[PDB]
Design a protein around this ligand. Sequence first.
Ligand SMILES: [Mg+2]
Ligand SMILES: [Mg+2]
Ligand SMILES: [Mg+2]
Ligand SMILES: [Mg+2]
Lengths: 110, 68, 174
Amino acid sequence: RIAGVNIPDNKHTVISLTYIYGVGRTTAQSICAATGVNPAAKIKDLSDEQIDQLRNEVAKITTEGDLRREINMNIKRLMDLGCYRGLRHRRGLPVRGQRTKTNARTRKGP
Amino acid sequence: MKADIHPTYEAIEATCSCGNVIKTRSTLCKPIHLDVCSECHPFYTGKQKVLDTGGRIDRFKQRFGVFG
Amino acid sequence: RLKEIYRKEIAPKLKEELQLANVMEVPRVTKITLNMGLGEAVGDKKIIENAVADLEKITGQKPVVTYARKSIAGFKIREGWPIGVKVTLRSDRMYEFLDRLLSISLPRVRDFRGLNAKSFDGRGNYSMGVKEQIIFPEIDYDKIDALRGLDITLTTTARTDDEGRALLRAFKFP
RNA sequence: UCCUAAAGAGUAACGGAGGAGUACGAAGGUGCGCUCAGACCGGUCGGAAAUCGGUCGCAGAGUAUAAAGGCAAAAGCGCG
RNA sequence: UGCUUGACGAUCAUAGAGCGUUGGAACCACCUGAUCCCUUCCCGAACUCAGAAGUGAAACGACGCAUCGCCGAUGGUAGUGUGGGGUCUCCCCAUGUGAGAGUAGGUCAUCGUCAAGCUC
RNA sequence: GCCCGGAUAGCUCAGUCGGUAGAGCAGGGGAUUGAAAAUCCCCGUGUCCUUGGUUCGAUUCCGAGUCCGGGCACCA
RNA sequence: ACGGCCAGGGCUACACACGUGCUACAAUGGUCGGUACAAAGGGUUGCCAAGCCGCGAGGUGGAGCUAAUCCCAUAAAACCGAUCGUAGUCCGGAUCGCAGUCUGCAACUCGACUGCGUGAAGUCGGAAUCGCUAGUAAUCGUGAAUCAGAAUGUCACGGUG
Ligand SMILES: [Mg+2]
Ligand SMILES: [Mg+2]
Ligand SMILES: [Mg+2]
Ligand SMILES: [Mg+2]
């Protein structure tokens, strides 16, 4: 609603845009360089005039509500095909090829 | 309508980023602009598009030519 | 005011659209009831007033707290007697609150579709659910607590739900 | 309180089944207003179910308390 | 010596439930905004108020249409008072009485007082 | 035959005045230790004997049905 | 055939417990922009510069070079200025999705890196238990052996201390 999702205040522009869930740290710097908003100033100090430009920039990369949909569809493409990469993904084993004998604990919990 | 029960319900102006001024009677008692309205939302503007489904065929031809 | 748009445009159009006989047979919106469900935090005695205050501002009308009529042991005990908060809005408030919908509360669902057209009653009453309480004028984000289950239940003078669809698509927000 | 008790009362058995040795300062009095249970459709984290809207209802709910007999002049529910 | 409609009743499914066409001449709600009374465990729909700018269908009003419900014969049977019997935990005879259920089929009820409209 | 008490983790015992199940042993994992025990730290466990009701809700309240104990089964 | 040759697969599986090692949990710190000093070693079947195109890993290019000559090769910590204000965060990087480069006939099982997005557990860690008495512990780099490619282990030497 503020930019697609609620944004924190009393913080710099680049850090504030990092919470948009689809723009990280480097792409946030590129958005600020293109628009002209100075990261040194807080989002509170900014005017309500260029935030439309910030929203336009957000509307050209992705929004979280569709990014999660499309990344889930990308996962589904592997999960419905028979590939080993999805075969381990459903069971919850490491996917990229990490060792499963020990310490594959992030994908299996305590 | 009971007198001393309801809040103050006055008239204010809702101005979107595109400039669509809407006269709305609310409890706001002040005008506040909005970032997006019914005329600017992508779904009602027709700009929502689709999730693009899947394009591996396309991708492979874009990636690898494979003459013959 | 949506009443002026309805009387001038929708009312004469729907008569010839739906092959109705005379002027007053056209469907019209009967009432709007919100019914913010305060089921969570039964034995609190602290969130009822917060929900009442939150719903008071977005409607311009004091709600009424709703008690229970039974006791689901799986749900909760009767000790937390107040469970619900309800509001009713007729034409003076209905057409003015309905302006928030379809004009500025369409950026309120954070959605792919405005509202599914397959959700209707057998007689033609429409219902919808609002996930978040952030979506309204004159509401803070820091001072507001994000625990507000709000519905928007619509009543229409329709014999069947196709008349309800035909009425809704005028002030369309699907 | 019901049956045994035989269509007025009454009627026994170490005969078959259940409860009481209280509660209410409003759970009483008056005026004014309102429907119950249950089924289905829809409605965001609830879901067979919580709170809401609509229809079908036509007392199958409820009675402060065990069962019997009654309760739309509601004997049930709310407000001054 | 008519039809329409309002009020209160006789009697409570042979009086009920369901299925069309309709009434502008008064009612019937609906409606403008709820200002003046009054009202909302929040609502001008409940309740109230200035009528009729509007409306005749949702709503109701009676007015069509016998599927369901209800009514229900005759006859027989069960039961039974009195008296006498048998093969006497049950039944029969003489006499008197006599159900319930089932079995052709009717019905969109039948009436009382007041008030108003249609013609004048 | 009649009457009183009890049924709780793998095993022994608390418990409720209905909304909730703990103590010890035992068990699992880790430390000790050359190794096993005893020391030490952490942890999972009952569907409260079965059934029918009372209730919004039963291990708890009520009536029955099994099993284990304790009293009596007397005057001839 | 318990001897041989060739394809794939396997030794990198996976509710679990153990040893070693690297990251962290931050403000004696995280980023941005300037600026200073090393040792040791490897390179004519090799090092592979400058210019050049790429967000980057890199691609072209071919010099000089058989070594105080040329390359690997910019050492980093520190110091100077700005911001962050201790917040599960300009901490933390695991995980996963998409897109590539290099090596190799061949990167699915099963490699190493680069670009974008995601952002977890983790707030200094029980009984216990280990290394260290001086350039010692602590912490930060550099280059090499094995090697087509592939290091948190390991080969070797240095900063502050
Ligand atoms: Mg009697
Ligand atoms: Mg008698
Ligand atoms: Mg009473
Ligand atoms: Mg190598």
